């Protein structure tokens, strides 16, 4: 009867929280590193482009 | 044949020991015909004849 605010209500940064499992979502806090490795079929070279 | 008012432009070069660079010569022929291509320099080395 006096639960209060639950999380996805009042986490920061907008995070949503779900259960089951419990999970919180596109919390938008700092960055991320990418690295991507490239075949060369993808590239085209400067004088047929 | 003679050829006159012409350029030369290098999209690509790396000196990778496999014809790594690729010239592209702009020309202006008298007429149609056959001609040799040789480099003045021997730092460079031409694949084709």
Known sequence: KERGASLQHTAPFGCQIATNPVRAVNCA???MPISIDIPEAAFTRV??? | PSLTDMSCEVPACTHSSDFGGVAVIKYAA???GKCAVHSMTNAV???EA
């Open chain 1, 29 to 31: 806090v700092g960055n």
């Open chain 1, 47 to 49: 004088v047929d482009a």
């Open chain 2, 30 to 32: 008298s007429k149609k």
């Open chain 2, 45 to 47: 080395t031409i694949r």
